[PDB]
Amino acid sequence: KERDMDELKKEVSMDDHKLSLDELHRKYGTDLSRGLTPARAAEILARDGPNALTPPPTTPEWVKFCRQLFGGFSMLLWIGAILCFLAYGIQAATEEEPQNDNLYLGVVLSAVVIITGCFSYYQEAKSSKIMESFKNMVPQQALVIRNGEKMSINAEEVVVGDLVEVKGGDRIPADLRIISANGCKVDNSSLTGESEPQTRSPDFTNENPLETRNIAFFSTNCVEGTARGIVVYTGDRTVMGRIATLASGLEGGQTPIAAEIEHFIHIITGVAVFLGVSFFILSLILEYTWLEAVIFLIGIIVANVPEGLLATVTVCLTLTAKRMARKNCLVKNLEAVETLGSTSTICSDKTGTLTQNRMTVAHMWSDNQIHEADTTENQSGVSFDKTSATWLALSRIAGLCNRAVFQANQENLPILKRAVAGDASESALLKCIELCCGSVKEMRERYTKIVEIPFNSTNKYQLSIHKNPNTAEPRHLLVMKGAPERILDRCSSILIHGKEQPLDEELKDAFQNAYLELGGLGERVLGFCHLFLPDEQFPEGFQFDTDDVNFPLDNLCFVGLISMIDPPRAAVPDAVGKCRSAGIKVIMVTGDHPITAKAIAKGVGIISEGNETVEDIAARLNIPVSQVNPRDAKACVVHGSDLKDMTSEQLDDILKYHTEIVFARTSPQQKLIIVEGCQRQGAIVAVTGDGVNDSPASKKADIGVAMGIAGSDVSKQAADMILLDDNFASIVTGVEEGRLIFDNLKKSIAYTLTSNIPEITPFLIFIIANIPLPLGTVTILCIDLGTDMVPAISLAYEQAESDIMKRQPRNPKTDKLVNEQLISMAYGQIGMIQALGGFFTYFVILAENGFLPIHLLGLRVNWDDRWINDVEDSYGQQWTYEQRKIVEFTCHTPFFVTIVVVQWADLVICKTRRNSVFQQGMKNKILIFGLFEETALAAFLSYCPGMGVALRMYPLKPTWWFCAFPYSLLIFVYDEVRKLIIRRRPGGWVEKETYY
Amino acid sequence: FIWNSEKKEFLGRTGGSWFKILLFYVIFYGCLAGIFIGTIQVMLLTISEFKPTYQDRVAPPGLTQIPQSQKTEISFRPNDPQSYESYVVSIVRFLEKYKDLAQKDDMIFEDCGNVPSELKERGEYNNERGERKVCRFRLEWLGNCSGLNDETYGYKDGKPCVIIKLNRVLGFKPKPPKNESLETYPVMKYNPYVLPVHCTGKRDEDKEKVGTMEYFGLGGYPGFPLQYYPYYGKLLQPKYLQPLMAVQFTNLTMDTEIRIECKAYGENIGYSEKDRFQGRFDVKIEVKS
């Protein structure tokens, strides 16, 4: 009954936070300031499980290695090996020739398969090796209170229902019910995706227990202050514990590639048995007695299946996924490399993912004008005009006034991605200071701090006083930052270009409308003000204290607002500009707030400047929201409120009638059913995240994407891809590569397959007209697997034939890797002309020595009898055995020579699917090398001494090579005029029938 | 899905335009062939209608038997009439072409020496001369085995016997070994006009030697008469009758199986280790009764 368990996990959770602290004290049994004794806590730590996740339930031993031994094609080839040995059978028994024939092949088959799996397992184990070197779990010990006494035991000996006390810096040990707090803002960015740090308190606020205030959550850390509260849920019972396991407990889902693998095995084996097996029925169907009529089937049908391509494939992907390994983005598995190129929809999270998850100064208010800072992570952006004095002032204000400070080793790190013990506003501020206006080390030590006032309880003000190092006015300096509304109340004088003024109600509403304008753009705004002290009323030596008003609280001198928001990663916006350029829907899912999410998404272009939601259309008309037709809003914003309250066809209608979708306030589990929903359309889905709310959406996506440093641990093991440098521009590469590697493999398969036509056609007619064996298996082994190896790999480095980021993504149903035109091409026309030349290569030689073509009918009978040493030709010459067999294996060897020859034409004409080879050119180096090496291996093999003795293949007389010439020629000619007429008139005929 | 059998205005897969796909394939294959067929027709005007362009592969001719057994093993019973019928029907049809009344037309036959003579060069290998006469062959020169009515018949029913025949090689002026015979074992001082062979219990070590041999030839020599070499080919000499050579095993232990290699010597004759039949000849025997 565990799918019923797998299902109360795709459901929103429920709890009990809304009680009187007394009602609390009655249910669990413990005291509020004194807690539970420690014999009761040595009775609860063993009634269930220590506050601990069941380790990842997945632990497959090194016998998991038979996984890369079966699958779709290897297990589709697996039979073949057994079939060979099954065909090997008779030889072993009846005195024939099993010693070295149908036994080596079996070994070869096994070995080939073995290699194929010993090499796609080795990598997929040097990449499960290099991601297990990043898990630095520093275990963090809970401050638990027990028999009054604050007893901070190990993170693993705590229990449901005893107090725990967070201070600043303590990871939260488990899921609590706050019973007391003091300025306690915790950071749950990791668990729900909330961005700025959130305050924590005991009273009861919301109801969705995630966003409520009297509940913290594991894995998130308490940012500032201190709190006391009560442990509700422990171990696997927490919220991030319901989510890790459901992440762990869903299916990776099939990849569109191993699928284009399967429907290929469908056609490969599909006709394989359909023809071959039915064709040896014909062998015995003529008049061949059953007993030995099928004594050659084991082998003649073997040629039909393309032994070798198995290796050529697992390499065409290996070279691709070694190039993505050079740009900082790792694939846990092979086949996922392609997936991105077939993506029509990209989900993507806001915090930790699209953003840097680090507060940073956004906009600034000075001289009744707004200035946009630089908000990136590698300083490639726009720096404001830092010449006005209004800036210089507002600057030393924020610089002097902070509790925030740099750590020791923070020098060589980028001024932004480096660390700051301290607040968020005080971190982002300190941050934009040390970057825009010089160093803060000698500016915060130039002014002597007299008496400070940290963040207060009533009103909002943080203030400090210093003395005057300037030479002009030795008057004293005072500074204060605070809320726009409650600092506009206590203020009067103003500041511009170095001279004061007062509050006019004109610029007070230009201030009330660029506070509500900068604040309405999602940015938490903060005013900055300063004042001089009347150095006649307070002297140059009077150390003030902290008991009474020592200086004018009113008639201060306001300077400017200063805005901050979590800003996108730099490479984000352009990445998306390409996203839609290729027609990929970009939807945004996030567990964050709909006004901070409305400003970031407009800022990124998921919502192009200029679709109105259902809500922008209704406050602007000043009508009730229920009035507008949702048909007229091209974009839309949906509060995850309505989302729980929603079915399938509904969700069906939103993704359908809305181009620019931004989801907000969605639990981790709600991102699954989103992926699953963009998945009830038939499209493929590509998911990218940071914390632990993505673990479910990262696993159920066709492919999940994570972050390397800014990510957590439960969506870095579930995703099917990881982004190491956190560079989000790297995704632009990935949809380009899987789409390209798509189009190259199509050429790659059609190459080896064409081989398969002059491959078997020999084993065929040899049975038809009773002629000697025009081509051998050993031969058959050095093409499918010997020479054809490197050219089938060189074709993987082919480049692009049009603009790839221009064509929309592929329809998983229509555009087939192997569609029915390729075979009408590789099996239809080329392999035919291909067969044509080897067989032409085949007559000349038996004819030139003495065996005329019309003569050779019915021959093979007398010719395969080991005892007929007198065998007349048309000229009347008597031939022994080893003599005419020698003429046989050298009608084996050059047929193979003739093959590579046409395989030249083929490789050159498969290189481009649409473009003339004179426009695309022979810029492919490896491909030239292929030509050179394949010919060389070949020519090395025939003329090497004792080659006739080992492999049954001898040196060719010279006049044999050039026989495949006008064929490989007419081949190159045929496909080139083929690939020109398609360039001219694609619409009528031609293209439709051929274009593979 | 798996049900695109009879789709609307379409059969399984496509069909509305089948005539298009199909017609393209007939022309194409009809043209793939008229090319290939050109090509092989080319290849056929360059083959000397008279001499094999390449003959190097038959460089060493070989020694074959008349009763081309299953595995050079003659296993029979000198009693049961059928034990030996595979073998003597094969002997009966082999020389079916050598009876003297078959070869009656003097137009194509000529009466040559009845003793081993010199090379009957009849011109050059072109067609400027008419059709060359074929030297005749009388079963007589093979004695006691199918030598006419005197004995034979049981064709080896009692003491087994077999003819050796050389492989016709177009042109072979077989060169025999000179009077300085580089160890050619016991043979008579007629090394000039004849090409020899001889047989052995075993090859080059100790041998279960059990046998007394008796050879039958043209006027009584043990080899091949040169007045019939090398062959002018099938189109120039049809019904040509190549020399045959008969070896007989009298003293044979019956219920045991030994072996016999028959080699043939000459600069013009060579031997292969991988081919037991090049230049030499192998037969095992078992007169099981």
Place this chain on the structure above:
Amino acid sequence: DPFYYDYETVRNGGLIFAALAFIVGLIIILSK
């Protein structure tokens, strides 16, 4: 005699044909 082919020279020669080709490509694939 037309019954003896010089197999050893065309053999010594395809091997030459093979290296040069094989090494031209090793000069083709390392453009430096």
